[PDB]
Design an enzyme around this catalytic site. Structure first.
Site, PDB file in Angstrom:
ATOM      1  N   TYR A 196       0.799  -1.218   0.000  1.00  0.00           N
ATOM      2  CA  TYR A 196       0.000   0.000   0.000  1.00  0.00           C
ATOM      3  C   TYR A 196       0.832   1.268   0.000  1.00  0.00           C
ATOM      4  CZ  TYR A 196      -3.268   3.605   0.936  1.00  0.00           C
ATOM      5  OH  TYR A 196      -3.978   4.787   0.889  1.00  0.00           O
ATOM      6  N   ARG A 218      -5.004  -1.904  -0.766  1.00  0.00           N
ATOM      7  CA  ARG A 218      -6.287  -1.713  -0.069  1.00  0.00           C
ATOM      8  C   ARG A 218      -7.475  -2.093  -0.949  1.00  0.00           C
ATOM      9  NH1 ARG A 218      -3.138  -1.667   3.571  1.00  0.00           N
ATOM     10  NH2 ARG A 218      -2.859   0.064   5.051  1.00  0.00           N
ATOM     11  N   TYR A 265      -1.754  -2.212   8.166  1.00  0.00           N
ATOM     12  CA  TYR A 265      -3.157  -2.453   8.397  1.00  0.00           C
ATOM     13  C   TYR A 265      -3.473  -3.295   9.631  1.00  0.00           C
ATOM     14  CZ  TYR A 265      -8.001  -3.915   7.131  1.00  0.00           C
ATOM     15  OH  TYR A 265      -9.372  -4.099   7.080  1.00  0.00           O
TER      16      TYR A 265
HETATM   17  N1  NAP Z   1      -5.782  -5.543  -0.939  1.00  0.00           N
HETATM   18  C1  NAP Z   1      -6.978  -5.491  -0.321  1.00  0.00           C
HETATM   19  O1  NAP Z   1      -7.987  -5.427  -1.034  1.00  0.00           O
HETATM   20  C2  NAP Z   1      -7.074  -5.513   1.128  1.00  0.00           C
HETATM   21  C3  NAP Z   1      -8.349  -5.457   1.729  1.00  0.00           C
HETATM   22  C4  NAP Z   1      -8.542  -5.474   3.063  1.00  0.00           C
HETATM   23  C5  NAP Z   1      -7.439  -5.542   3.878  1.00  0.00           C
HETATM   24  N2  NAP Z   1      -6.139  -5.599   3.350  1.00  0.00           N
HETATM   25  C6  NAP Z   1      -4.993  -5.687   4.265  1.00  0.00           C
HETATM   26  O2  NAP Z   1      -4.063  -4.600   4.206  1.00  0.00           O
HETATM   27  C7  NAP Z   1      -2.716  -5.122   4.217  1.00  0.00           C
HETATM   28  C8  NAP Z   1      -2.026  -4.993   2.844  1.00  0.00           C
HETATM   29  O3  NAP Z   1      -0.612  -5.302   3.012  1.00  0.00           O
HETATM   30  P1  NAP Z   1       0.578  -4.311   2.575  1.00  0.00           P
HETATM   31  O4  NAP Z   1       1.903  -4.930   2.833  1.00  0.00           O
HETATM   32  O5  NAP Z   1       0.264  -3.865   1.188  1.00  0.00           O
HETATM   33  O6  NAP Z   1       0.509  -2.928   3.451  1.00  0.00           O
HETATM   34  P2  NAP Z   1       0.428  -2.659   5.036  1.00  0.00           P
HETATM   35  O7  NAP Z   1       1.024  -3.928   5.466  1.00  0.00           O
HETATM   36  O8  NAP Z   1      -0.897  -2.231   5.436  1.00  0.00           O
HETATM   37  O9  NAP Z   1       1.518  -1.491   5.350  1.00  0.00           O
HETATM   38  C9  NAP Z   1       1.633  -0.241   4.473  1.00  0.00           C
HETATM   39  C10 NAP Z   1       2.514   0.476   5.340  1.00  0.00           C
HETATM   40  O10 NAP Z   1       3.094   1.422   4.193  1.00  0.00           O
HETATM   41  C11 NAP Z   1       3.750   2.596   4.821  1.00  0.00           C
HETATM   42  N3  NAP Z   1       3.226   3.718   3.946  1.00  0.00           N
HETATM   43  C12 NAP Z   1       1.988   4.374   3.788  1.00  0.00           C
HETATM   44  N4  NAP Z   1       2.073   5.475   3.081  1.00  0.00           N
HETATM   45  C13 NAP Z   1       3.411   5.584   2.749  1.00  0.00           C
HETATM   46  C14 NAP Z   1       4.154   6.561   2.015  1.00  0.00           C
HETATM   47  N5  NAP Z   1       3.580   7.640   1.493  1.00  0.00           N
HETATM   48  N6  NAP Z   1       5.511   6.365   1.866  1.00  0.00           N
HETATM   49  C15 NAP Z   1       6.111   5.277   2.402  1.00  0.00           C
HETATM   50  N7  NAP Z   1       5.489   4.319   3.114  1.00  0.00           N
HETATM   51  C16 NAP Z   1       4.128   4.528   3.254  1.00  0.00           C
HETATM   52  C17 NAP Z   1       3.267   2.813   6.174  1.00  0.00           C
HETATM   53  O11 NAP Z   1       4.206   2.784   7.034  1.00  0.00           O
HETATM   54  P3  NAP Z   1       4.697   4.240   7.478  1.00  0.00           P
HETATM   55  O12 NAP Z   1       3.536   4.955   8.097  1.00  0.00           O
HETATM   56  O13 NAP Z   1       5.790   3.896   8.369  1.00  0.00           O
HETATM   57  O14 NAP Z   1       5.144   4.847   6.227  1.00  0.00           O
HETATM   58  C18 NAP Z   1       2.569   1.552   5.973  1.00  0.00           C
HETATM   59  O15 NAP Z   1       3.016   0.638   6.910  1.00  0.00           O
HETATM   60  C19 NAP Z   1      -2.900  -6.576   4.717  1.00  0.00           C
HETATM   61  O16 NAP Z   1      -2.975  -6.718   6.154  1.00  0.00           O
HETATM   62  C20 NAP Z   1      -4.187  -6.999   4.102  1.00  0.00           C
HETATM   63  O17 NAP Z   1      -4.814  -8.086   4.736  1.00  0.00           O
HETATM   64  C21 NAP Z   1      -5.905  -5.586   1.962  1.00  0.00           C
END
Ligand code: NAP
EC number: 7.1.1.1
Length: 177
Positions: free
Chosen positions: A27, A62, A143
């Site tokens: 994300y 997301r 998330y």
């Molecule tokens: N894909 C879907 O449709 C969907 C739906 C529902 C739930 N989810 C859930 O959401 C998560 C998706 O996993 P993921 O690895 O993609 O992301 P994530 O694990 O949610 O982590 C994204 C993290 O990105 C960093 N971030 C945000 N904006 C940023 C920016 N401008 N520059 C640099 N870093 C930034 C933040 O850390 P900082 O604040 O430290 O920067 C952030 O931790 C999963 O838990 C999944 O189950 C996904």
């Protein structure tokens, strides 16, 4: 302090020394609109003969398929974008992993702690590579609201900043040749 911070020049030297690179986007990448500098970075590194691919978790982002759609829209060719179960076995043979805005999708506690809230959930095994660089703004959560052990592992370096600021700067330094 419990993690290692690196600068942009350290990151460039790690890229230069790597033959094989996998980018695991999450994300944070698309929050920052970093897909545009990244597509050019990948084109340049591929032209230097490096093997550069993306490994994308099915729940990255997301919205379903969000990272796949936005990287395609930005011009990344489909043939270097792989699914998690297509690429996970390659991490032990990978010189460098760029974790760009991903966290939950690369969190080793899902395998290492049977009492974690994410225990048993599938993740990308990025910590098995030779070197990991995590690009995000802080040591904070994603998330699922849990800490990620990979930030404190000995083969992880944190490259802290907004993802587009960092990737724009890395694109510039690689374009220098
Ligand atoms: N894909 C879907 O449709 C969907 C739906 C529902 C739930 N989810 C859930 O959401 C998560 C998706 O996993 P993921 O690895 O993609 O992301 P994530 O694990 O949610 O982590 C994204 C993290 O990105 C960093 N971030 C945000 N904006 C940023 C920016 N401008 N520059 C640099 N870093 C930034 C933040 O850390 P900082 O604040 O430290 O920067 C952030 O931790 C999963 O838990 C999944 O189950 C996904």
């Amino acid at each position: 302090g419990t993690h290692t911070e690196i600068n942009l020049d350290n990151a460039i030297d790690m890229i230069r020394e790597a033959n094989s690179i996998i980018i695991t986007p999450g994300y944070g990448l698309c929050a920052a609109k970093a897909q545009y500098p990244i597509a050019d970075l990948v084109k340049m590194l591929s032209e230097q003969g490096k093997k550069v691919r993306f490994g994308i978790h099915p729940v990255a982002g997301r919205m379903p398929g969000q990272l796949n759609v936005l990287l395609a829209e930005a011009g990344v060719p489909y043939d270097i974008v792989l699914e998690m179960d297509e690429i996970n076995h390659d991490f032990p043979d990978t010189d460098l992993v760029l974790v760009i805005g991903a966290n939950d999708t690369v969190n080793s506690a899902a395998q290492e702690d049977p009492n974690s809230i994410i225990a048993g959930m599938p993740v990308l095994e990025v910590w098995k590579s030779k070197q990991v660089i995590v690009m995000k703004r802080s040591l904070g959560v994603g998330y699922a609201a849990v800490d990620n052990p990979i930030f404190y592992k000995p083969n992880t370096a944190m490259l802290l900043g907004d993802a587009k600021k960092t990737c724009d700067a890395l694109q510039a330094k690689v374009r220098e040749s």
